[PDB]
């Protein structure tokens, strides 16, 4: 899916 | 000395539930009572000892019917253990997805929202914040009983702001604007996540902003885009959902107001029902 990430 | 301290020997591990970027969790047995419990573990894993021990210290200070209850700890010598009550139906996200919608009807969804707001209101007073308010972190017990996972609580005088390290990851689709742009958090950031949680509930576990790539979420929020009212979702609930996504923190209601709102809808919904 894709849930966690570092802000852009 | 500490009344929460339990010798490692009192618990036996039964089955592993799921791993975690913060420590695998197990289903275990507290022999003395023949009680099924949940065991939170951590090896030279993800978290670092001191942080883990502080979470444990914080968990000993909370008590609310809608917050998973701490039962004991093993913090003296490795491996470290955090023991909590066991929620038989797992997390809310998976529950909503595989449930019987005739049983998990409209009044049950309102009831569930009321239990969560209740926990958050309380967390707002005792000067706490939940790092990740989302359906995946809500557990379910018998009779539609919902509780918020307590392992994600932190200390923060209600009203103040926290600034996370640089380069850190956040669950994008549940994160408030102030956190995406400046890595800032507050009980108001939790209010924003609550709004998204209300949406997961109204859609029975659908993923937020369907088809919208993580990289495009912030730009959309900026230009004033917001998820549309779900099919079947009562208008009043959608208004709260919308009040929770106000771009400006101090414009979002408090959990004290939100719990009052749901309390009202759940009772007046139990009346027209039994009538
Ligand atoms: N974004 C994130 O939430 C990071 S944590 P994660 O590793 O990505 O996922 P998660 O599995 O949710 O983490 P955790 O170890 O917190 O949960 C593991 C699984 O076990 C079940 N669980 C957790 N506490 C439980 C209690 N008290 N009783 C029964 N089952 C419990 C969760 O449903 C989860 O799948």
Residue numbers in the entry:
A (entry chain C): 104 to 111
B (entry chain A): 232 to 506
Text taken from the publication that reported this structure:
BCR–Abl is a constitutively activated form of the nonreceptor tyrosine kinase c-Abl. The improper activation of the Abl tyrosine kinase results in chronic myeloid leukemia (CML). Our results suggest that interconversion between distinctly different inactive conformations is a characteristic feature of the Abl kinase domain.
The other crystal form of the H396P mutant has two molecules in the asymmetric unit that are in different conformations. The first of these molecules (molecule D) is in an inactive conformation with a flipped DFG motif (DFG-Asp Out/αC-Glu In) despite the presence of the ATP analog in the nucleotide-binding site. Previously, DFG-Asp Out conformations of Abl have only been seen in the presence of high-affinity kinase inhibitors such as imatinib and PD166326. The second molecule (molecule E) in this crystal form is in an intermediate conformation, with helix αC partially swung out of the active site and with disruption of the conserved ion pair between Glu 286 and Lys 271 (DFG-Asp Out/αC-Glu Out). Molecules E and G were obtained from the same crystal form of Abl and are very similar, except for the presence of either the ATP-peptide analog (molecule E) or the kinase inhibitor PD166326 (molecule G). In these structures, the kinase adopts a conformation intermediate between αC-Glu In and αC-Glu Out: while helix αC is not rotated out of the active site of the kinase, a rotation of the side chain of Glu 286 has occurred, resulting in the breakage of the Glu 286–Lys 271 salt bridge. The conformation of Abl represented by molecules E and G suggests a mechanism by which Abl can interconvert between αC-Glu In and αC-Glu Out conformations.
